């Protein structure tokens, strides 16, 4: 069945499970060519991103189809729709799989032969297969007990030279470190409470942020039961996972519980099997973003302030109305012990499969899948205004510029219901004729996906701390939503074989979709793959295996739901930092929806051509695999930006080609292999070339994916890679000299934003090593990704706050920007003269806050890194020690994940593996003070009975 | 107002250091064309009732006027066509000012006597007062043409025919229907007192003029300094300079008079205040008739309208009979000076867009000959009430702001959007 005409990679469960990760796919980061796998954050329960051969979908569905046995597994993401003010990520549908349950994962990277799975297989397939019952000794019980810690990996590198102040001057209530160079002298700080004030030495506390963090801790327990006969098998498993992350208190929390029971029974020509699985989850997120969020509050701390001294709330100076600074942040310990962001989900999925063999060469199969989920979010904020405003500095002493305005409390709750059903009807025919071999299978596929939720919210909490829809004197806000889409299709997959040497397969599939215009819902897509193992019938025996493959094929695709017709929404108006919605005042109103529909759309069509080679030498002691692919995604249906003066802000239409060409390359070999010792190396390499080819130019050939209003924005532009950033840049004279304001000394903005990079790695590769010696196992895996940029609010804040090491630049003495001029303009004769205006000490703060000489583009940070991804020390106890014991096998295990990261010198701020805008395309925009990545290490005990 | 010293949300508005890519208008452009003007197009497609069409046309015209007074050119005649023209050409402000004035005319003449059968939160189906809203906009635009010296002769006789008919609106043209809860407040309040923290402090021109005139209105919207209990304005774009000169500790919010948000939670949104209406007639009388007695009548109608709205009815005496009184003004220009300055006060905390545009048309308040740094060094040089070019000024040509950038959304998706000019180039009707 490796008559496959395109690249794929197979991983056995033993390697998936061995990293002891809560999730199936994050242990695979950097180990498979062409499979880009990254976590959104180190926050427990976060989503994972998986993107195969680059982005094709401009918004925003690039995850591979996960097919578990083999039924489409639902893999929807639950993350915050506003990552600037309240970023949270609650998880990814594939996370529910118990990794201990996996037998083999095959990842199919090719979109040439997709008739089996349909449209969603164009982003690739993750073909999981779960363990089955087996005969063995003795009782069939496997136990896995885990324990693990996490610590913070990379904090921003801080200046330790200047303490609390602004404009270079000493203040007692600043959120920033633009004060004087440290003396060691006795200064005042913080508010004054009851006619007394805190007075401490004016020295730096280099570890103040480092010591705020705890060690995360995580226990896990997995149990399985299996048995078989010669007619049946049964497998039943339980897994539990309890995570409390490094952020102090229980606010990083993830609890996972899974239960699963699968069985088969053959009777004659008939086999029936079923697999039914239940998954539970409770996440608690420490919300990120620019307001009274924890980390924003934490980064805006003077370098002389002890953070762990701020925790005791019986010290009145830490009480919220006397907290030392009032500048739009709060005590992080108060935010963590008093704000609620909670998620809970129960989920049931399973399949029924009936196989019936007849007439010697035919097999009928019916397979039904059902995936259903209910989730409940609960978010609350205390009503800070009525709790602390009158009587306090922070407080009515700050008036309209208080952090309690209008923090009047909020509480909401959402309940979400998802349910996918998939039905497969297949008859397969398979007969050898001479040395030839014919495999023919035709099938029907029905699919139905539905999601709905209801949402309700109250503001202005009467009793300030109680989060309950009853606790407000003001109107509630309610929302409800429902989507339903359906697909049917027939498909056929003919596979010819000659003498285990020449494999040639052709596919063909025509779908009908609800989400396309009625006049055009049928789309057809064929595909041809071939395979030829030339070492079979080439002597020696030095070429263990030699395979060459080719594929040419199309997959179709429909749109997202409800994009054909004009809608009227209930009239609302998005205004800076707020809305003005109807009803007013008693009247309700409907506005024409701001996205223009289209009844002329055609199906999406993805075309791909791929060649590849696979050779092995010296009894599989040296192997390589290489693939060359050329994928274009055409006519993709997208809500494309349009000039609002047309009447709409976007129009649904078919785009042009998004192209990904690239090379995937995998080389492994075992230099050393004796009886007791083996050493294997593995090197995989990927280089993908992203190019948008055309965006319908009648609307311009640019469209926003994600961006701040008048700030750094990521785009799709006609001739360029997906995800190019535009950012503000300094003006420059014809000679490359930086133009500077003749009075203040600070750089002048250019007319336009500058194109300042794309989101794409230029290349990404991994290097791995495995050593076995007498049942001792040692694995080391390195992940390398180089190229691309990413917005980093982590930097932006430590520049603005004056805590980054870069801001200690001219040792903060007034300075002229090197190589600076002034633009002298008299009506229309522009002339540049040498600048003699310095940045004053009082304005140094603003030179850095706006980004120095880069201006905004400074906060585009190089995405590159090398990571020591995972290390796994494993010890299979010698079987003789297990003799007067009930144990068949014991293996103790020590592992670390995400252990160390190296980055270019231009990035001393973040682990590039962060986001705030999800696990798909918009996540590449950057990180909006995501919580800092963690380093995880643990033990695992495996006991077989 | 200016930027409060201890926050930062509007540094670039204050120092004119914004650019086209700062999108300082992109939200408003969106909700004006893809919201207001599209719904108007559909209303026009769905009803055949003249009075509804009439009041709809007036709100459509009002939206075009706003855009034109921001960017001179605006889409029009080719806008609101969806996929038939996703890139509408930008008509010159003059072609749309004549256009929308033609539309109001055609719609008024279409009236038949039948009532409005539509929810009207401006006038509650009072056809008479939509008529007055439409004449008030004619007055407003007729005078734009005259001071732009474009067909001034005829628009001069129409503006006089308009004012002697006196067929204007009573009370104020406002959307008063906000509540102090959530997504239902005054937009400005919501954005600047709920969404953001306090960013606004009083500007120096306003505070020096109100305190010079001995005006009690100075307590409405403006609070005393917490440091000392006085009224202190900040010189335009001078936040960073006062901190440089006085030290960080002696130019905090404590030292400058804050804009008071508490009156704004449910405050209406004004399209045409009555004080402004009278001040425009007081101008037409004083300047195209020669009817001092009537000009003075409409001038005092203006001061006492605005005095009642802010809750100071009975106290217009303090600027009407106090010094800056219609008679301590000998030249006819000193009296037009009086009208424009009291129009300027009456528009604070009411209709700021219209204040700026009338500042551009009459160029009164004048621009001070003295720079921010000089005014700060010895205040005696400054005559209270005239504008001050920002201390740091991102306009290569200095002076005051004359127009707003084109929307970045229009720039990126409409090939025909006029090339970005600097904020110093005037709109088509500001000719001095």
């Amino acid at each position: 069945e490796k008559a496959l005409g395109y690249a794929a990679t197979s991983v056995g469960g033993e390697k998936i499970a061995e990293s002891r990760t809560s999730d199936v796919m994050s242990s695979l980061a950097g180990k498979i060519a062409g499979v880009q796998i990254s976590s959104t954050s180190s926050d427990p329960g976060a989503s994972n991103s998986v993107i195969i051969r680059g982005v094709s979908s401009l918004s925003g569905t690039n995850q591979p189809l996960y097919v578990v046995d083999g039924v489409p597994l639902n893999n929807s993401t639950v993350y915050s729709t506003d990552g600037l003010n309240s970023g949270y990520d609650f998880g990814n549908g594939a996370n529910a799989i118990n990794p201990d349950d996996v037998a083999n994962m095959t990842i199919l990277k090719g979109a040439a032969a997709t008739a089996l799975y349909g449209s969603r297989a164009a982003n690739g397939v993750v073909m999981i297969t779960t363990k089955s019952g087996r005969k063995e000794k003795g009782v069939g019980i496997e136990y896995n007990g885990g324990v693990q810690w996490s610590t913070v990996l990379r904090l921003p590198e801080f200046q330790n030279e200047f303490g609390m102040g602004w404009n270079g001057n000493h203040t007692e209530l600043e959120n920033g470190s633009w004060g004087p160079r440290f003396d060691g002298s006795m200064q005042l700080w913080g508010n004054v409470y009851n006619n007394s004030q805190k007075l401490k030495p004016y020295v730096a506390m280099p570890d103040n942020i480092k010591d705020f963090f705890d060690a995360g801790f995580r226990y896990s327990n997995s149990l399985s039961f299996n048995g078989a006969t010669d007619k049946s098998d049964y497998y039943v498993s339980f897994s539990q996972i309890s995570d409390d992350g490094m952020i102090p208190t229980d606010a990083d929390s993830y609890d996972k519980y899974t239960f699963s029971a699968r069985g088969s029974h053959k009777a004659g020509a008939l086999t029936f099997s079923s697999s039914l699985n239940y998954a539970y989850q409770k996440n608690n997120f420490a919300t990120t973003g620019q307001g009274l969020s924890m980390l924003n509050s934490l980064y805006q701390t003077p370098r002389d302030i002890s953070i762990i001294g701020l925790e005791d709330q019986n010290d009145p100076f830490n009480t919220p109305g006397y907290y030392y600074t009032p500048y739009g942040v709060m005590n992080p310990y108060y935010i963590l012990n008093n704000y609620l962001n909670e998620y809970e989900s129960e989920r049931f999925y399973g399949k029924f499969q009936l196989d019936y063999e007849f007439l010697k060469y035919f097999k009928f199969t019916y397979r039904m899948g059902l995936d259903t989920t209910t989730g409940q979010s609960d978010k609350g904020k205390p009503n800070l205004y009525a709790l602390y405003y009158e009587g306090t500095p922070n407080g009515e002493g700050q008036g309209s510029s208080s952090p309690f305005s209008g923090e009047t409390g909020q509480y909401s709750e959402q309940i979400t219901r998802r349910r996918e059903i998939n039905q497969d009807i297949m008859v397969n025919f398979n007969m050898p004729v001479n040395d030839f071999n014919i495999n023919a299978l035709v099938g029907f596929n029905g699919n139905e996906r539905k999601v709905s939720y209801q949402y309700s919210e109250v503001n202005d909490l009467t009793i300030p701390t109680w989060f309950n829809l009853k606790n407000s004197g003001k109107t509630p806000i309610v929302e409800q939503h429902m989507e339903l889409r359906r697909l049917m299709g027939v498909f056929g997959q003919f596979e010819g074989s000659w003498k285990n040497m020449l494999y040639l397969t052709v596919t063909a599939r025509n779908d009908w979709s609800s989400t396309l215009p009625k006049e055009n819902r049928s789309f057809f897509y064929p595909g041809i793959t071939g395979s030829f193992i030339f070492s079979e019938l080439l002597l020696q025996d030095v070429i263990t295996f030699g395979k060459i493959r080719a594929s040419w094929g199309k997959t179709g695709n429909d749109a997202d739901v409800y994009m054909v017709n004009p809608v009227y929404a209930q009239s609302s108006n998005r205004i800076p930092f707020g809305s003005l919605t109807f009803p007013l005042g008693g009247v309700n109103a409907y506005s024409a929806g701001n996205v223009l529909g289209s009844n002329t759309l055609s199906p999406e069509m993805t075309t791909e051509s791929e060649v590849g080679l696979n050779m092995a030498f010296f009894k599989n002691r040296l192997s390589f695999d290489v693939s060359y692919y050329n994928r274009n995604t055409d006519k993709q249906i997208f809500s494309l930006a349009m000039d609002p003066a047309s009447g709409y802000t976007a129009q649904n239409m078919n785009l042009g080609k998004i192209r990904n060409r690239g090379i995937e390359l995998l080389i492994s070999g075992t230099p050393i292999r004796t009886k007791d010792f083996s050493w294997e190396l593995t090197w995989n390499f990927t280089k993908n070339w992203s190019k948008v080819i055309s965006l319908p130019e009648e609307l311009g050939g640019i469209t926003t994916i994600y961006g701040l209003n008048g700030g750094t924005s990521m785009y799709a532009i006609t001739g360029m890679p997906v995800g190019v950033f535009k950012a503000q840049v300094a003006e420059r004279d014809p000679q490359g000299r930086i133009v500077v304001n003749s009075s203040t000394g600070l750089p002048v903005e250019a007319s336009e934003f500058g194109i300042c990079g794309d989101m794409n790695n230029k290349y990404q590769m991994g290097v791995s090593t495995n050593l076995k010696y007498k049942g001792i196992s040692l694995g080391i895996d390195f992940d390398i990704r180089q190229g691309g940029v990413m917005y980093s609010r982590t930097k932006d804040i430590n520049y603005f706050t004056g805590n980054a090491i870069q801001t200690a630049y001219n040792d903060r003495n007034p300075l002229i920007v090197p190589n600076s001029v002034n633009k002298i303009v008299n009506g229309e004769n522009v002339t540049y003269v040498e600048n003699t205006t310095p940045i004053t000490s009082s304005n140094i703060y603003k030179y850095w806050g706006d980004g120095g000489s880069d201006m905004g583009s400074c906060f585009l940070v190089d995405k590159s890194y090398v990571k020591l991804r995972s290390v796994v020390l494993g010890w299979d106890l010698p079987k003789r020690w297990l003799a007067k014991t009930p144990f068949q096998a014991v293996k103790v295990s020590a592992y670390g994940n995400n252990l160390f990261v190296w980055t270019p010198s231009s990035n001393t701020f973040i682990d590039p593996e962060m986001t705030s805008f999800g696990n798909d395309l918009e996540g590449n925009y950057g990180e909006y003070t995501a919580n800092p990545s963690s380093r995880r290490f643990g033990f695992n005990l495996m006991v077989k009975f | 107002y200016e930027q409060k010293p201890e926050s930062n949300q509007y540094n670039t508005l204050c120092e004119y250091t914004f650019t086209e890519s700062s999108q300082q208008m992109d939200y408003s452009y969106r909700i004006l064309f893809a919201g207001a003007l599209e719904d108007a197009k559909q209303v026009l497609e769905k009803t055949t009732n003249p009075a509804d069409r009439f009041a709809t046309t007036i709100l459509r015209a009002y939206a075009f006027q706003i855009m034109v007074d921001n960017t001179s050119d605006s889409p029009y005649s080719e806008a609101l066509q969806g996929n038939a023209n996703a890139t509408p050409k930008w008509d010159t402000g003059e072609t749309v000012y004549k256009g929308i004035l033609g539309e109001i005319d055609a719609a008024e003449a279409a009236l038949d006597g039948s009532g409005m059968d539509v929810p009207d939160l401006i006038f509650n189906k009072n056809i008479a007062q939509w008529k007055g809203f439409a004449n008030a906009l004619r007055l407003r635009m007729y005078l734009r043409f005259i001071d732009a010296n474009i067909d001034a002769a005829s628009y001069t006789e129409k503006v006089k025919t308009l004012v002697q008919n006196n067929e204007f609106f009573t009370g104020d043209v406002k959307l008063d229907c906000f509540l102090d809860e959530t997504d239902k407040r005054n937009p400005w309040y919501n954005t600047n007192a709920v969404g953001l923290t306090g960013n606004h402090c009083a500007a120096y021109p306003l505070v020096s003029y109100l305190s010079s005139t001995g005006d009690p209105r100075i307590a409405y919207g403006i609070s005393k300094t917490d440091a000392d209990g006085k009224y202190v304005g900040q010189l335009p774009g001078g936040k960073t300079h006062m901190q440089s000169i006085l030290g960080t500790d002696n130019w905090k919010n404590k030292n400058v008079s804050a804009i008071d948000y508490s009156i704004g939670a449910t405050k209406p949104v004004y399209f045409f205040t009555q004080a402004e209406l009278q001040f425009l007639i007081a101008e037409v009388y004083a300047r195209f008739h020669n009817d001092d007695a009537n000009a003075k009548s409409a001038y005092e109608a203006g001061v006492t309208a605005d005095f009642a709205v802010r809750g100071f009815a009975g106290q217009e005496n303090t600027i009407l009979e106090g010094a800056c009184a219609w008679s301590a003004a000998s030249t006819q220009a000193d009296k037009l000076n009086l009208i424009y300055m009291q129009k300027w006060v009456s528009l604070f905390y009411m209709d700021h867009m219209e204040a700026w545009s009338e500042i551009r048309r009459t160029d009164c308040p004048k621009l001070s000959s003295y720079s921010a740094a000089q005014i700060q060094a010895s205040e005696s040089v400054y005559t209270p009430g005239e504008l001050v070019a920002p201390w740091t000024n991102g306009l290569e040509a200095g002076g005051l702001m004359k127009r707003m950038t084109y929307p970045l959304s229009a720039r990126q998706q409409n090939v025909n959007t006029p090339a970005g000019v600097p904020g110093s180039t005037p709109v088509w009707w500001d000719i001095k």
Partner: peptide
């Protein structure tokens, strides 16, 4: 773009 963003305090 879309989505606001506030300056800090100092």
């Amino acid at each position: 773009g879309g989505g606001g963003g506030g300056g800090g305090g100092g």
